[PDB]
A paper describes a structure:
A common type of LCC in hardwood is the ester-LCC formed between α-1,2-linked 4-O-methyl-d-glucuronoyl moieties of acetylated glucuronoxylan and γ-alcohols in lignin. It was recently discovered that an insoluble hardwood lignin-preparation (LRP) is amenable to enzymatic hydrolysis by a glucuronoyl esterase (GE, EC 3.1.1.B11) releasing aldouronic acids. WT CuGE has a modular architecture with a N-terminal carbohydrate-binding module 1 (CBM1) domain connected to the catalytic domain by a proline-rich linker region. The overall fold of the catalytic domain of CuGE features a large ten-stranded twisted β-sheet flanked by α-helical elements and a surface-exposed active site.
Despite these extensive interactions with the 4-O-methyl-d-glucuronoyl moiety, soaks with the methyl ester of 4-O-methyl-glucuronic acid in concentrations up to 0.5 M did not result in a complex, indicating a low binding affinity for the ester and a clear preference for the larger aldouronic acid ligands. The binding observed between ΔWT and Um4XX-OH (Kd 5 mM) can be interpreted as a measure of the binding affinity of the enzyme to the carbohydrate moiety of the reaction product.
Numbering used by the authors: 80 to 460
The structure:
Amino acid sequence: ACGAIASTVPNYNNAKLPDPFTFANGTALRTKADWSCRRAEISALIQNYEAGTLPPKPPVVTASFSKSGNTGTLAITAGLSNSQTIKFSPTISYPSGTPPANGWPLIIAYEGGSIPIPAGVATLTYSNSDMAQQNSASSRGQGLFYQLYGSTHSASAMTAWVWGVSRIIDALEMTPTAQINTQRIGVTGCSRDGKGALMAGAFEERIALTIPQESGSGGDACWRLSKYEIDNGNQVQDAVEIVGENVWFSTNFNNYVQKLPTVPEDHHLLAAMVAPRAMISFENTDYLWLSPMSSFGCMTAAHTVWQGLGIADSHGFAQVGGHAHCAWPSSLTPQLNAFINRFLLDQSATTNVFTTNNQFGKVQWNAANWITWTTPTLTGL
Ligand SMILES: O[C@@H]1[C@@H](O)[C@H](O[C@@H]2CO[C@@H](O)[C@H](O)[C@H]2O)OC[C@H]1O
Ligand SMILES: *[C@@H]1O[C@H](CO)[C@@H](O)[C@H](O)[C@H]1NC(C)=O
Ligand SMILES: *[C@H]1O[C@H](CO)[C@@H](O)[C@H](O)[C@@H]1O
Ligand SMILES: *[C@H]1O[C@H](CO)[C@@H](O)[C@H](O)[C@@H]1O
């Protein structure tokens, strides 16, 4: 449908943010349907430059389910055509009583997440660290995912985590007795797991609502903007430091962290891969390590894709200070609940949330220095 998908752009060189609305081959997006093909191209580019290869669904995916009290266990086996298999068993915490006719809405929470989950939503606890370890650079190629695909598989730890989420949703589709509404699945995580949750929502289209919390550099911040922050004296995490600190990105990314303008994507395009589905991310200006200006500018740039698709209110961003890292401030519960209410609970909640305190330290956000495109009105359904 999309023709030959570009995964490498050898001649690319753009110090500003890559344009969401033009394909690698120079074709301008015109229809809402065009975004499907552009998202597939962005997927290939992100895999090639920074995330490694995301394997497709394997030939063997089996699931069994059992429940004790209000806790379900979803036992998953995944296997390749060469007979290799791995197994993992996430748990689900259920609300009590009769579920809705179509099952409970569900949030997949990376290691439990750090947001309050409303009482009518089930929580699946995903041990992403067991799927792909993330202690330090020493963790490269370690985890269940690599016991299936091999320790030298190019998938980053975050890409391995996505693969696991995709197997969980496969298992839920195959297991109606788990009583989950598979059309109302969200994902969340905080800090390094918030980087993971953004990757999951971007790459796994069956996720209705994505909630990254204080994800920082490699999450809802942009590489190019964080480079600008660190060059101007903000003590931010940036691409150069992050690839030496852990294994959240492919080893191939090391070849580009000093040459960011040659990368034909940034994390505004990563975030835009969630479109036309819903996402709200939350940031904290108390920690310059999280690169506050970069997140605001990056999500402002990503927002133009939802704007061009006529669904601006499906994308939210709320950035405040005054609380510890991954502590949830009660002041943002209304904004969080608005998105859960609308996109997981089918309520008529308004979701116009795009706010910052502009506390960016030694830099300012100047959209004209970073966003070079006008937002088109994409046509059609
Ligand atoms: O040690 C790292 C290498 O493993 C890495 O190799 C890259 C992996 O992805 C491939 O697509 C690239 O061709 C290849 O260069 O390069 C960087 C190095 O730090
Ligand atoms: C440009 O690339 C996109 C994505 O692969 C494709 O859909 C489109 O048809 C291409 N343009 C031409 C003129 O082939
Ligand atoms: C990235 O991926 C594309 C296909 O997804 C290839 O055509 C390209 O050569 C690179 O391997
Ligand atoms: C895109 O990626 C390829 C490797 O997949 C590079 O060889 C090329 O120069 C461009 O960076």
